[PDB]
Amino acid sequence: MPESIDERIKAALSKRGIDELYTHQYSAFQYVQKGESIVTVTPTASGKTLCYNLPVLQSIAQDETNRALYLFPTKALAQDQKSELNEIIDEMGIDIKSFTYDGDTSPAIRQKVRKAGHIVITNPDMLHSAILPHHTKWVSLFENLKYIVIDELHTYRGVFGSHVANVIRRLKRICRFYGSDPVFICTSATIANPKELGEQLTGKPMRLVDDPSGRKHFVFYNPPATAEVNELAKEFLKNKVQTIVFARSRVRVEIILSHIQELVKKEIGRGGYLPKERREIERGLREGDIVDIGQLQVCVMTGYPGSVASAWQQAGRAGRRHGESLIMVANSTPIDQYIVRHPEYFFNRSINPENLIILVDHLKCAAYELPFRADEEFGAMEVSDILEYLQEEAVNGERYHWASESFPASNISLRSASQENVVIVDQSDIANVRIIGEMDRFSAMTLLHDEAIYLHEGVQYQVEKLDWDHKKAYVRKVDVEDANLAVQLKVLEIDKTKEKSRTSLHYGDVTVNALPTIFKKSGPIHLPEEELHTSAAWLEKTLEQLLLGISNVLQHIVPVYIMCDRNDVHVVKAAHTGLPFLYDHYPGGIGLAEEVFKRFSDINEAAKQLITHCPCHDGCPSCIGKAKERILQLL
Ligand SMILES: [Zn+2]
């Protein structure tokens, strides 16, 4: 082992015993010390937090005047990582103070951690809202902000991805002023474009790290869900096999765990969780009867968790050292049945800051937190003439307010393009009236319309009311367990066009309108409407029905490859070109069309194979809702 690494760290890691010269940790540390940003796809069982901890703590131990900044999604994960690294600081013995700076920290120590904390953990919302606008009170952080750590990079996508990219633009701008360009260390999971997603974020050409421990078994069956998973778990427990099941929604967890718990507890005799009891359960699991919290012997799932990365991660939570283990049951849903009938995405792998509205919002924010100068750029967005129409307002531009409640950041809620959008309030029980979700204008028109069928994470809901003039959905949770809208459209421009074999493929910008019309399951509804300018990638009555079938195929195939919500983008003679339309949901380009521009060839090939190998008769209700081969030979 090279003696370049600090011997304090070497001995502290030799105490626990993980001194193995490992592959991905080596490739990460070497080329992070070299100065190149990295993105890793290593699982939790292999490397986990150490791959980004080790270079950070090495730089902290070398020069005491070094600071690190972490991006973790929630306050619970912030506290978890803080405790995990505080344990290693304790084993190291070096006077290093690392804390979290989020909404639930004691104010008596906030100034302290601003003046003396080495590592600072903070979620993007709190970061953007408080830390960067008051970067003055963070001088000591930004003068020596060497590294920037990001956990779960795939969560930063869509509107959240664009907003976080703009926040990191502001962050790098502040660092440029304070003279401390940081190298970026991003962690993620199994996605199709890990390096391509890491490059566009910060505009840095970071490298991706892909790299016996036995072999893990895979299950590909479907019973003709809760009770069946319970029976599988009870078989494993009768055989005395360490088993883990994965229910996501807390309510489903409580129900299934009540079943399993009464049974097994009579046999054997998340968010709201705290780090003390978390470490107690870790102790129990890894050195008792029932973060390296422990290693499981078999993994049981509960449907496709709506993410390629999340499924692989929850599968990788289990594993042994030089041993074998086993890995999912679908439900009465075409999406889970589809991911069952499509295991071809497992042998290997299976967004746009150019949105001008978010650009204007973050321009206002940056102008508040740091004055601009038009004489330098790396190649990002900074056209000064556009940066100069932001002027006064006689009778939205800037708000030169001398009051205190008004703010430039104000309503710029980056979690879901919440310029002005709806907030969801659960009216099931008054005691703890749970305010849960938030949704854009058009997204709420599509989903949260009054008296709808809302499904929020395996739990059924029912919309009671929607205050549209103040954007507030009031819903009711149901245990007894569709929608529609259509109107005209207009076009703008095309920045990417084709002419291949009569079938021209265009990508550009358009402007659409809205109208709720009716909803399915059988009722009409009206709501005030507004236009929407965004990017879009696109290409007698029997032909209209054929195009409707094509639209069904696309609506059921596109969310898979783009890995987004099913109700993000929406599929549509056209007056633009005289003959007969994917468009982005949220105002402005969000990559949901440029990714289609990139991968439309493979999308069309997969559509061919899907419409051919569908277990039906020339079209299934889950794919179309000899027309099959006619569609095939037309496309
Ligand atoms: Zn079919």
Curated annotation (Swiss-Prot):
One of its GO terms (molecular function) is ATP binding. It is an enzyme of class 3 (hydrolase). The keyword ATP-binding applies. Keywords: ATP-binding, Helicase, Hydrolase, Nucleotide-binding. Belongs to the helicase family. Residues 29-209 form the Helicase ATP-binding domain. ATP binds at residues 42-49. Gene3D superfamilies: P-loop containing nucleotide triphosphate hydrolases. Its EC number is 3.6.4.-. The keyword Phosphoprotein does not apply. Transmembrane segments: none annotated. GO terms for biological process: interstrand cross-link repair; nucleotide-excision repair. A motif (DEVH box) lies at residues 151-154. Residues 228-357 form the Helicase C-terminal domain. This is Uncharacterized ATP-dependent helicase YprA. Pfam families: DEAD, Helicase_C, MZB, WHD_HRQ1. It comes from the Bacteria.
